[PDB]
RNA sequence: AACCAGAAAGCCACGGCUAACUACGUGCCAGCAGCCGCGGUAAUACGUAGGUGGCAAGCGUUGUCCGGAUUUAUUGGGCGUAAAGCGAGCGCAGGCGGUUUCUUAAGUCUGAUGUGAAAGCCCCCGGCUCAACCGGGGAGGGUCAUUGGAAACUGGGAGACUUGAGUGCAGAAGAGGAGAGUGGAAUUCCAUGUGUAGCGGUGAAAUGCGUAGAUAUAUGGAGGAACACCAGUGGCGAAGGCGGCUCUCUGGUCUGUAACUGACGCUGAGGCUCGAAAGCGUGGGGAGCAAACAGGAUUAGAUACCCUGGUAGUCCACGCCGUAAACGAUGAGUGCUAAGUGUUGGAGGGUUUCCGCCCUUCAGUGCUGCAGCAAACGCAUUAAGCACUCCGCCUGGGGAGUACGACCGCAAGGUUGAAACUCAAAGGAAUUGACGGGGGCCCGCACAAGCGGUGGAGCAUGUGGUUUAAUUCGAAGCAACGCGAAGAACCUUACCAGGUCUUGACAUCCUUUGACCACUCUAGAGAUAGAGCUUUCCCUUCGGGGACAAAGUGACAGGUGGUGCAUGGUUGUCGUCAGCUCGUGUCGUGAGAUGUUGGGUUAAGUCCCGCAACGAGCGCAACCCUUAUUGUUAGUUGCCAUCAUUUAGUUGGGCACUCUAGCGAGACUGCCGGUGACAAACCGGAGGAAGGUGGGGAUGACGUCAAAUCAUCAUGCCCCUUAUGACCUGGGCUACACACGUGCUACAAUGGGAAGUACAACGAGUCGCUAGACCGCGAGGUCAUGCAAAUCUCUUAAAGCUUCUCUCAGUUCGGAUUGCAGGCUGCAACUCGCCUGCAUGAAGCCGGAAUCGCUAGUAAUCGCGGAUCAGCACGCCGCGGUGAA
């Protein structure tokens, strides 16, 4: 193994962090908070399935903010879950948090979601072939520039690993104006354990 | 004729061929199969389930005959490499044959006549209410038999012709054959002279020969074998084969020409002859060379390769055997079908001192290439092309050219030549990878040139081995060994001796209940035990759970236990090596190829030119960070130039310089000259702070190694559970008869010791760094001031510079080891921290074989800061000074 997490490379030039802090004598204890914040979406991740949550900070107020693709379960029925999500997450802060929920647009483009939905198909024993290739044709369906794919381990229910992806358009992995996402997830059916590997680039 | 759909349906397969399915318990065992092949938690091959799927009382299995099988090919196959042209010639019998006149009519076709039993298979028509039965007709049963005709073709008879086939006469070439003599050189032996300590051989040596005069050098003498240059893809012959020269007998081929014979030819089973080396018998000669054999060497072993010897043989005469990778792996005879180019032997013409030259034509003999053939490679007037005549041979690989029988031979052996039983392949040619102890080109501190090292000595540190009760686990060439460990006294821990415990040390629910705790006393090594103060409601609609404990068992928990060869994730290594592919159009019957090859150039698939290729993508490069100049902006905690002050840029003042860091400019072959195809590019020059990707960093393609990891994490499967799980004390991973790797300090004069004397950069700081003062030989001790930061501290850096010193010694070098006295953090420095002082003073005078790093702010030397950290660094990460060959 030699290749780097594509998004470490980009960060300070491109993008920026998900936690816009600046704090002396209590950041570690703000840090494995954080931690514990990360935690609690996997009651959002079975339904909700958000993709990045951005993390601002006052002087003695926290103020988050999500992003999503499906804002239907995570909006309640007439906001009373999300008041109930406010009170579940001040049991675990006891600070005053106001959290806020933002939609994106031209939803099959993300990194994250897609690779989550192939392992999903891996999770219900569909083929790994047919299932990359219709994914990375809906993803060019939603116009971009190229879309790079890779699964690995015990392939299909078989014995020792084999290691295998598809691709197609361009996809300029070692340049710096680039703008490109990436996203990893395990799968598991019920032998051993898989994983899913995931590339969209579409120009600065 | 009275009443019923009641009395009244069967059988094998479903992985491909094979239309004709899905799912459940079975687990390389039991089993299945016509061929291919299935069985280790899947058998879509055992049983079950519905189905599915087939003809019409049947359905599977075994056995036998024909087809598919052009796999005996007459219709209808082949022999360069896949099975398959005899080793080659001479020829009896046989097969097959130039043109023409007349003639017979054997073969040939045809007319008529006689028969080819009945029943069958056919067809038409009737009945059998449709299968079966009969009836009348016709090809159906001949290579038939008799009688009558044609002479086109082949047989037969009579003749005719010269084109095929042979002797003329004239020439020509030639390692054609046998027999008889002869020439010189070279080796070996012998003799003679001269002349002394070695000669000979190998990768390295040794065996061997030599003072009983070798080897070497000149002179002769003996004998055998082979013929240096000429020598050529030249020549000769049916093949095997044939090279010095002179002579006798003798075979064959080519060119002219035509008076002469007049179809006399070709092929050729049986038979005969010739037939390389090795071998056999009888008789000769041995100069070399050399099977068998002896000795030396190599090797784990070497009945071989290597070296020193050495017989049969190799030679001649006379007999025998009759084989070869006897090959162009291509049978023989004849005819026909584009060119170009050498060369051997001729004939003719133009021209001519032709000896050259040029044109035409015969027989060989090479080389390149149309049509055509071929699975391809290839062949191609010397066909593997289009054909006719004759002969030989083949029908999957083994068994095996074996067995029996027969013939030949003195003998080894030769010629002719099967089956029982096995296998589902064996085989030819070509394409892509991989490999080679095959080759051509390139590139890297890879060699070479230097500098400093390791291996010698002392110490620290990491492995293997021995150890104990335990020395806890992993990592093994580069690509393990100052590595996980960026901090082992208890904790750290998994390793031991002991004290111990159990829905548990930790998670979730249920009820009883609701909130616990926390803290003092006693026991002890501790976990724990017994008391003590009591615990505690945050909604009250008398109705209750949220913050909480204890008890019950219930769910369950826990494993640093195994498997990195069941895994994800992550990381080494080729290696910053320069490659790896796609679309479209072309080539190839097809796997696939071309683009990606060639010339130049570069750090590079980087770029130019030619090229059935044209374009693109991942890489390379560019965008990113820092360093190298300068403009603007903004001036404190920063700096002091215009002046005063004060120890002092301090305080008045300015943002001038410096510095701080935001936005900007600047280096792109940018211009000129030469080289280069004018192209890419290479070499110099000006400008500038840097000019040829200015100097570094981050960035690691396709893929290789089942490389490393369950011991960061997650985890498929397997195992443990009043225990391999948990709590505590003490010990250990820090041992040492030994060997290896990595670092620190010296072996002193460019130096040690004493004194005085200057200049950096990065970063850190709240229970953390310490200003100043006092005391101490010191490690340090006390009072205390600044500091959450360009301000206060770490902190005034070492090598540096000037004076004295020592005077070559195991030394005023060196500084390990050991007693004593201490200092600091720790609850506690014995096992096992660091540092100070006194007393002690070992090896060690530049380190073999071998081996490592490095092409310039580098190597070499010298200090400083940080991580983890109460404490502990010769390790790691980073910065700066001096500065090489």
């Known amino acids: 193994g030699q290749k780097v997490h594509p998004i470490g490379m980009r960060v300070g030039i491109i993008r920026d962090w998900d936690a816009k802090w600046y704090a002396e004598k209590e950041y570690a204890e703000f840090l494995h908070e954080d931690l514990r914040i990360r935690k609690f979406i996997a009651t959002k991740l079975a ?53 806020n929920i933002v939609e994106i647009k031209k939803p099959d483009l993300d990194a994250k979601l897609v690779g989550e939905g192939i392992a999903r198909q891996l999770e219900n024993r569909v083929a790994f072939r047919r299932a990359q290739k219709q994914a990375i044709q809906r993803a060019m369906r939603a116009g971009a520039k190229g879309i790079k794919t890779q699964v690995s381990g015990r392939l299909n229910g078989a014995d020792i690993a084999r290691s295998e992806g598809y691709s197609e358009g361009t996809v300029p992995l070692h340049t710096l104006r680039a703008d490109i996402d990436y996203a990893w997830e395990e799968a598991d059916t019920t032998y051993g354990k898989l994983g899913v590997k995931v590339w969209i680039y579409r120009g600065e």
């Open 47 to 99: 339904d909700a399935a958000v993709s990045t949550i951005e993390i601002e900070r006052a002087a003695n107020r926290v103020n988050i903010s999500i992003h999503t693709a499906k804002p239907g379960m995570v909006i309640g029925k007439g906001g009373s879950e999300v008041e109930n999500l406010r009170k579940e997450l001040n049991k675990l802060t006891g600070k005053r948090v106001h959290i």
